[PDB]
């Protein structure tokens, strides 16, 4: 939702009225691995998942 809102804000900033919406494609492939981390945990998580 945030990504779509940012894209819409960009489209408003630009002069093009052509939509550029996006939709989810649920494949069977393995999704990537995402870890939000604060500065108190970034080094810890990096050393752990090395």
């Amino acid at each position: 939702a945030t990504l779509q809102a940012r894209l819409g804000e960009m489209i408003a900033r630009l002069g093009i009225d052509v939509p550029s919406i996006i939709q989810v494609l649920d494949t069977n492939h393995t999704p990537p691995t995402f870890h939000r981390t604060n500065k108190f945990t970034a080094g810890f998580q990096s050393i752990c998942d090395c």
Binding site: L14, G15, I16, D17
Partner: protein
């Protein structure tokens, strides 16, 4: 459903149609109020529902004094013309009797801004049919003050866009193309203002505005007139195309520029080409060619423009042209990058008559320095061009150093090295380095 129909985007025109369609009590209530005729009421009854009764409807609209009722009737007529279920009948009812078209046009171009816009759109749609062009009626509509005032009001973006689209559609037929340019000064400055302002509706306004200019650019005489009388907008069109986002606008701008610079147009081979060089068009065209335009037609137009610019640059590489420019003042910058440079034949010719051209250039520079008007921007540009040419000549012919020293050119260059004009200062420093580095060694 008719030969052709308008295809306005109607960002606010559709809202205007809905508002007009919102109020419909005037179709029959006016007759009860002794305003509209009973036959007029019967005709408007059909209009209320979503071949021959058009003429009495037009007569009732003309005779009616209630502006709202006239606006509703005109909106209904416009919808019938636009609607596929009645477009063919609407086209036929005027095609088979073109006499009433003039009366209908006279009925239009009046009332409120929305009402006037709707009536004008209806009139344009009627007059844009394959038959019954009615050039005189088109000229009268162009001379109408209401439409011109609506078009000039750049503040109302929706109204300006609607007026521009109507004018562009009315210029599709070449029969009315010449009459359109008859009042070019009335609208084109506003049209060029729209492009200047740019540099959904806003993008759409530019596309038709560029189309309107391009459409009128078919006639070579009109092309030359537009290039001359409005050279500022013609020059700024290159920058607009460079900064444009949509590919259609850039393609239209490139096509307009090419048509203006086409060899068919009179004085285009020289005056227009030089004006392009006066606008730094060569690097812009090179960058545009570097850019990967999606449209194949746009790519072909860019290639043609690049070829034309290359031919103009080659023609500008004439030593005779450089001599002629040096004969007068206000030297141009396109020759001196080749003739006093890659075109060593020009330098060899300048060598003749004991550095005659070098002596003339040194005399011009000394006169400019002694004039005391170096602070002038034009004088600064002339001095910079002269310094660049002198530096180019000195490297080729070391013998000219003695001529410069005898004429005081070395002292003048040294003094100019301290000039506050940084652009001129760089050229002066380069010339001094060339003279001291090579000849004085």
């Amino acid at each position: 459903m008719g030969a052709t129909k308008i295809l306005m985007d109607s960002t606010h025109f559709n809202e205007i149609r809905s508002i007009i369609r919102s109020r419909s009590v005037a179709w029959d209530a006016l007759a009860r109020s002794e305003e509209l005729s009973e036959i007029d009421a019967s005709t408007a009854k059909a209009l209320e529902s979503i071949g021959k009764t058009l003429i009495p409807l037009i007569h009732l609209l003309s005779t009616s004094d209630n502006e709202d009722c006239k606006k509703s009737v005109q909106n209904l007529i416009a919808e019938l013309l636009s609607s596929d279920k009645y477009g063919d009948d609407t086209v036929k009812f005027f095609q088979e009797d073109p006499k009433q078209l003039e009366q209908l046009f006279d009925v239009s171009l009046k009332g409120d801004f929305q009402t006037v816009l709707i009536s004008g759109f209806n009139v344009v749609s009627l007059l844009v049919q394959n038959g019954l062009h009615n050039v005189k009626l088109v000229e009268k509509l162009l001379k109408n003050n209401n439409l011109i005032n609506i078009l000039q009001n750049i503040e109302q973006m929706d109204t300006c866009y609607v007026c521009i689209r109507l004018l562009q559609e009315l210029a599709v037929i070449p029969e009315y193309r010449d009459v359109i340019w008859l009042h070019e000064k009335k609208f084109m400055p506003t049209l060029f203002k729209i492009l200047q302002r740019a540099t959904h509706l806003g993008i759409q306004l530019q596309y038709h505005s560029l189309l309107l200019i391009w459409l009128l650019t078919f006639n070579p005489v009109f092309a030359n007139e537009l290039v001359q009388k409005y050279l500022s907008d013609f020059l700024d069109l290159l920058k607009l195309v460079k900064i444009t986002i949509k590919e259609k606008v850039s393609r239209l701008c490139i096509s307009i520029i090419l048509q203006c610079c086409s060899t068919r147009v009179k004085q285009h081979k020289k005056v227009i080409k030089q004006l392009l060089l006066l606008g730094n068009a060569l690097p812009t065209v090179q960058s545009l060619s570097e850019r990967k335009y999606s449209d194949e037609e746009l790519r072909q137009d860019i290639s043609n423009l690049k070829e034309i610019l290359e031919n103009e640059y080659q023609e500008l590489t004439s030593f005779d042209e450089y001599v002629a420019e040096l004969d007068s003042k206000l030297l141009c910058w396109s020759p001196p990058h080749v003739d006093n440079g890659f075109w060593s034949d020009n330098i060899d010719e300048f060598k003749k008559d004991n550095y005659k051209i070098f002596r003339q250039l040194i005399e011009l520079l000394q006169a400019k320095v002694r004039n005391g008007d170096v602070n002038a921007k034009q004088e600064k540009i002339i001095i910079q061009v002269a310094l660049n040419d002198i530096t180019h000549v000195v490297e080729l012919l070391p013998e000219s150093i003695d001529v410069l020293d005898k004429t005081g050119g070395k002292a003048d260059i040294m003094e100019l090295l301290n000039h506050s004009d940084s652009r001129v200062k760089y050229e002066a420093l380069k010339a001094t380095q060339a003279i001291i580095g090579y000849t004085f060694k």
